[PDB]
Paper text:
Monoubiquitination of histone H2A at lysine 119 (H2Aub1) is catalyzed by the RING1B subunit of the E3 ubiquitin ligase Polycomb Repressive Complex 1 (PRC1). In vPRC1, also called RYBP–PRC1, the RING1B C-terminal RAWUL domain is bound by the RING1B-interacting domain of RYBP or its paralogue YAF2, whereas in canonical PRC1, the RAWUL domain is associated with CBX proteins. We uncover that human RYBP–PRC1 binds unmodified nucleosomes via RING1B but H2Aub1-modified nucleosomes via RYBP. Here, single-particle cryo-electron microscopy (cryo-EM) uncovers that RYBP–PRC1 uses two different interfaces for contacting unmodified and H2Aub1-modified nucleosomes.
We reconstituted and purified a RYBP–PRC1 complex containing full-length human RING1B, BMI1 and RYBP. For cryo-EM analysis, vPRC1 was mixed with 5′ biotinylated Drosophila melanogaster mononucleosomes that were either unmodified (Nuc) or fully monoubiquitylated on H2A (NucH2Aub1) and each sample was bound separately to grids coated with streptavidin. The vPRC1:Nuc sample showed a homogeneous population of two-dimensional (2D) classes. Three-dimensional (3D) reconstruction to a resolution of ~2.9 Å revealed nucleosomes with one RING1B:BMI1 ring finger heterodimer (RING1B15–115:BMI13–107) bound to each face of the nucleosome disc. We could not detect density for the RING1B or BMI1 C termini, or for RYBP. The structure of these vPRC1:Nuc particles is comparable to that of the minimal RING1B:BMI1 ring finger-dimer bound to the nucleosome core particle, determined previously by crystallography. Moreover, RYBP F39, showing clear side chain density, interacts with H2A residues R70 and D71. These structural studies show that vPRC1 binds unmodified nucleosomes via RING1B:BMI1. Of note, H2Aub1 does not appear to impact on RING1B:BMI1 binding to nucleosomes, as the RING1B:BMI1 dimer bound H2Aub1-modified and unmodified nucleosomes with similar affinity. Our results argue that the high binding affinity created by the combined interactions of the RYBP zinc finger with ubiquitin and of the RYBP47–58 loop with the nucleosome acidic patch directs vPRC1 to dock on H2Aub1-modified nucleosomes. This binding geometry allows the freely exposed RING1B:BMI1 heterodimer in the same vPRC1 molecule to engage with the acidic patch of an unmodified nucleosome in the vicinity and thereby enable monoubiquitination of H2A on this nucleosome.
Numbering used by the authors:
A (entry chain D): 28 to 121
B (entry chain L): 15 to 115
C (entry chain E), G (entry chain A): 37 to 134
D (entry chain K): 3 to 107
E (entry chain F): 20 to 101
F (entry chain C): 12 to 117
H (entry chain B): 21 to 101
I (entry chain G): 11 to 117
Write the structure that this text describes.
DNA sequence: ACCTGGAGAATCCCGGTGCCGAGGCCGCTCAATTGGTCGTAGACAGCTCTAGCACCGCTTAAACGCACGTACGCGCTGTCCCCCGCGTTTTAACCGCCAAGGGGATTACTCCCTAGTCTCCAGGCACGTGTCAGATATATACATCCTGTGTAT
DNA sequence: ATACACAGGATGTATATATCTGACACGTGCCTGGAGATTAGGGAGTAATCCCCTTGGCGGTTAAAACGCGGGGGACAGCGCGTACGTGCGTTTAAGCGGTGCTAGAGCTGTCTACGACCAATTGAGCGGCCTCGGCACCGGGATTCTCCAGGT
């Protein structure tokens, strides 16, 4: 009965935003959850390494940006950087 | 360096915009060739332009072409990985909406 | 006199058929018995979850399909159409597993 | 099919902001698909490394590698603007009529 | 009981089907024992690491997450089991 | 009267949960304010891309749902996404159809 | 007549010599210029520590030596003694780099 | 000014590297393919090195940058720090 | 009142306290137990001694007094378990083993 | 400018094993790097082991399990024995 | 050379600590190299899994795989001890005679 | 296998010679099972292979493995490193006491 | 079809000499050690109930064994052009300075941002329910493979 | 006389309708974790200074790269034999489904106390220079191993 958490509802919301009239099965959502966890873990580890190399004790958005530059290939990195900067500028404006 | 300005280009003057109210006559056949999607054979909608050859297409046309078929440009056969290699071209959309609403 | 297909026709048929599907190709109970027999050499009176055996079978079949994919290229490299043990040995040497 | 339109509505989509005149040998920056003149952009990219309008970085070190010619737009503007190609050819001939050097360019 | 001879449960037609999914057309007759050897080596390695993970946790039952951690330790990430 | 940070950033993926996961994960002594927002945006983007391609693949089959086969097709037919997941195995995904030219009849 | 060695002798001599030595086999300044030229597409007016150029060269030489060993194995598989571009392509594909 | 410096990887250097690799007979179309391979490898490593240098707010590339860049690629180096 | 070191209390040559501090400051967990650094230092010294002994034998074989990178490389690539431990590692100024394929020899 | 490395301890171990033998500066650099690499690998595996079982403390048990996972064959057995011997000697003191 | 060696000095080296006698069909444990008799080790290992001298594990689940017959040691004990091999064969044949 | 036979299940113990007795021995008697196959001399710091139970001198086997094939000199079986052997103290002590 | 002798070119061995890098010493200051208190992570006993192992018939689809013939694996031969070995002539890497200065590395000061604490309420998760997307079944209809047979060059 | 396009037979694959059920998707009540306000201190941004090391010029000596030629052995195509594969048939084995009963062990709670974090004072281990000989690098010489082609049979 213990609570277990996942990213299922957020994935469903994104899918309804991109393909309004489509579903998804249990196994496909399991795979999507694994994909999201893998990405989070990789980026966090690379940011930690960056912070440690430079003798700093904080992870800021700068570390995340450089880690994304290091990890994703090609145009995926460009689009991800643009989206991240957009989100941060929107958030700090409140 | 394939970009050196020619002698005339080093001294070319701007072309003054036409301000007098003169009517313009345009026929559908004149713009027929340059404003036609090679794939669907219809008027362009939601224009997408490649990052390598600057060839206009419809979003669905290019998406379907890349999905089931070679990962190449339909026109010049140049390679392109996916839809991230194209970007929207709203200027052509506005031009289409203006000339032929 | 029956309608005998020439050699190689049914082979291409089966290649197409099995590259169209996603089902497991090895029977369950034999694989489970093999897994238990191998595990008996590291710890006594083990128990398994069903999903653990499923995960092992999935990973193993993926591994073997990829290995045969490389083996076929090695066999075609030498102007052949038939795989042999030497092709598997070369693929596993170049991949680093040996 | 059949339609006649004024030049006022067409003007905005034919003039280069850097110089103000109609597009001549249009060239497009691909980072944002922004069209300007060949000479305008060639002179502009020397001092700056950002787009004149949206200030988007053309390239990390060398912007000239990320700009390409736009033939279709040039043909469209030639067909639309009345008496534009003829004037361009006349100006080119006039400029090169008094220079007896480098015949082949 | 002491299980034995179970490797021969991986039969000739099953290996043929696996080679079909990999795009193979003709198969030599000495190639059904090599596959069994390779499968045994791979399985031994993965199962040993899974058993180590199980033993550290002080458990008597191997779980799917143990298999997943063991596979990830060998550079064979697997999506679909948690 | 309380507004979630996800809405403030214009996002769906949770910003507070990701902030907490960064704080308790042994990555560094301190976590800034902009890090979780940035990382949440990147995760949302990648998920949306993959799901879009899988939805197209599902539409081609005349199916209204996405199954692991459609995700496999989407990922392997995409070059950059195929580089990102070069060492991953997706269960019940099968393979891509492919036959070498020398094996086909002449 | 003047003495001439049969083909394959001096090649074996050179294999014996270079498999026992340990020094760098690419000239230094040309590699330095190549490094600066390639880096000029990421940042302008960059400076390099000498040990950084040295580390880059050492790693590059190790990479090429390993590749050539795999290529020789692939070429011998097909009953030849001459290595060819297709052997390089096959080795790189099986390695996962192609 | 730096241009066409990949031709400084002469043919005899390529032959010496192949001899250390054990090769006995070489085709005439192996040198261009080797140069292509090398250039791709160098682009990939130097990109990461320059990323590390840029993040640390410097203008000099050190040996640690190269070491970390190689470690990212899975090609650990020993003996430089 | 005399200060007695932990390495001496353990019988090691490697530094226990420095390894304890490195473990504490490296972002590996909230707490570190007392015996963990002793165990880690013991393992580290054992591996160092193994490699050094093999390389010393290789240096003696060559009639040399000082260990250089070549002896490390020979000691490490002639041992199966150590080769497996360092498969993705390059050693500067090492070289390769002598190896000519059988099919390529004359006669 | 105080810098730290394992040089003096590695020299002591070499003198224990090989009473009359020298080492070069570059070889000592390689040995330093090797020791650092092993330390990092084992510490990272121990961190993961503690996180999988929901514990906040790395102990000798985690180090032993990590050494078993990481080292191949006989190296594992010998290293395990040496670590256990060291801990037993330490505690009784 | 010639020597007059007293067996009383060599007794501990040639005595099995499980049956209180000399080695017969000696078998050694790989891990610790501790010798015993075939019967002694076979019947003893069916319950425990540790050597009865140094207290070291032989195998995780099946110790029988880590014990090997030492022909050299058995030959040495047969040769050094006078009037032992012959007596062993005599007893074996006499036992065989008494049963079908 | 290692399954005991009918007679092995009831072998009687061999009593030890408690009474002090002297036994005459000669060096040539044991000049076959105490001799190193490599250096053809007396054993010192004996080392034994796990798989085959073959005795060697430490330096002999160490050099043979380092400067040659990685197989056992006698049986030609797989051998990885000096970790694959183990010292034999009992054999050395017996040799020392038997031969001064 | 195999052998030997002898000339030539290359690798190994041996002193002998000179320098420079490795082993060692000495003063000092920063990090490891001892001693004390305090709070919680982890050990352990006990309890619930989920799920993993074991057993038994019954269909039936897959596995197993057999036989024929065909096409592919492998050796042999002949051909020619591509690459190796070696000699001559050019290019330019390597090494010894000198001169300058860009920026890497450290220090001091100040204030802004992040951790820790406490209150309180909405976002997310565990159950429960019910239609329809998708699988399963039958039956035509269509598209490939193979072979006989005329027959044109 | 032989290639060769053609046509009829017969498999297998694709397609449209019927239908059956169980899993996706939604709703709901509650409780745990995210949000808001407050406070305090140390990490990091900033400005200034010093001096190591990177970049540039130049002149020289000489090993390495470039060009060319000639001939042999290695890649490549073709032909023939034969035997090991594939295809199809007629038996035999064991996977698989459904149902059952049993209980070992994973997942929780609740005490409770030993072990690790924190702080302060004290000093000895470890690091930055500095001096200096002995290992090793270099040069010339004699010995030693090994290819290669002419007889020799
Ligand atoms: Zn279209
Ligand atoms: Zn195009
Ligand atoms: Zn303009
Ligand atoms: Zn722009
Ligand atoms: Zn006994
Ligand atoms: Zn024992
Ligand atoms: Zn010996
Ligand atoms: Zn042996």
């Amino acid at each position: 009965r213990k609570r277990k958490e996942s990213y299922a509802i957020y994935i469903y919301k994104v899918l309804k935003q991109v393909h309004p009239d489509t579903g998804i099965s249990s196994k496909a959502m399991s795979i999507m959850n694994s994909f999201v966890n893998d990405i989070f873990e990789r980026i966090a580890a690379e940011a930690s390494r960056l912070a440690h190399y430079n003798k700093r004790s904080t992870i800021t958005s700068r570390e995340i940006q450089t880690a994304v530059r290091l990890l994703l290939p090609g145009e995926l990195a460009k689009h991800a950087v643009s989206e991240g900067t957009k989100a941060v500028t929107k958030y700090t404006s409140s | 360096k394939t970009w050196e300005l020619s002698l005339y280009e080093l001294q070319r003057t701007p072309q003054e915009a036409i301000t007098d109210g003169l009517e313009i006559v345009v026929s559908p056949r004149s713009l027929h060739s340059e404003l036609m999607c090679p794939i669907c054979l219809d008027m362009l909608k939601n224009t997408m332009t490649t990052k390598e050859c600057l060839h206009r297409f419809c979003a669905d046309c290019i998406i379907t072409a890349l999905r089931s078929g070679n990962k190449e440009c339909p026109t010049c056969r140049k390679k392109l990985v996916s839809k991230r290699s194209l970007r929207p071209d709203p200027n052509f959309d506005a031009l289409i909406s203006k000339i032929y609403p | 006199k029956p309608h005998r297909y020439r050699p190689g026709t049914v082979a291409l048929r089966e290649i197409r058929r099995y590259q169209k599907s996603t089902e497991l190709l090895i029977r369950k109970l034999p694989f489970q018995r093999l897994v238990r027999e191998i595990a008996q050499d590291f710890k006594t009176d083990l128990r398994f979850q069903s999903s653990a055996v499923m995960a092992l079978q999935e990973a193993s079949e993926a591994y073997l399909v990829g290995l045969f994919e490389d083996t076929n290229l090695c066999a075609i490299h030498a102007k052949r159409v038939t795989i042999m043990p030497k092709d598997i040995q070369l693929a596993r040497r170049i991949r680093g597993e040996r | 099919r059949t339609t006649r339109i004024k030049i006022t509505e067409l003007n905005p989509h034919l003039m280069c902001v850097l110089c103000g005149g109609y597009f001549i040998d249009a060239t497009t920056i691909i980072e944002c698909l922004h069209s300007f003149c060949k000479t305008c952009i060639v002179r502009y990219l020397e001092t700056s490394k950002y787009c004149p309008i949206c200030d988007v970085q053309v390239h990390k070190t060398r912007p000239l590698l990320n700009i390409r010619s736009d033939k279709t737009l040039q043909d469209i503007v030639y067909k639309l603007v009345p008496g534009l190609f003829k004037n361009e050819m006349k100006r080119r001939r006039d400029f090169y009529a008094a220079h007896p050097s480098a015949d082949a360019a | 009981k002491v299980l034995r001879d179970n490797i021969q449960g991986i039969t000739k037609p099953a290996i043929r089907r696996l080679a079909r999914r990999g795009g193979v057309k003709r198969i030599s007759g000495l190639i059904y024992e090599e596959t069994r050897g390779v499968l045994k080596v791979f399985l031994e390695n993965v199962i040993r690491d899974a058993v180590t993970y199980t033993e550290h946790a002080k458990r008597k039952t191997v779980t799917a997450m143990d298999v997943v951690y063991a596979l990830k330790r060998q550079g064979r990430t697997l999506y679909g089991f948690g | 009267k309380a507004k979630s940070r996800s809405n403030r950033a214009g996002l769906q993926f949770p910003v507070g949960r990701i902030h907490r996961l960064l704080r308790k994960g042994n990555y560094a002594e301190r976590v800034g304010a902009g890090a979780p927002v940035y990382l949440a945006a990147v995760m949302e983007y990648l998920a949306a891309e993959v799901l879009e391609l899988a939805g197209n693949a599902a539409r081609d089959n005349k199916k209204t749902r996405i199954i692991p086969r459609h995700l496999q097709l989407a990922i392997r037919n995409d070059e950059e996404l195929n580089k990102l997941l070069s060492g991953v195995t997706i269960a019940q995904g099968g393979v891509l159809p492919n036959i070498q030219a020398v094996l086909l009849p002449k």
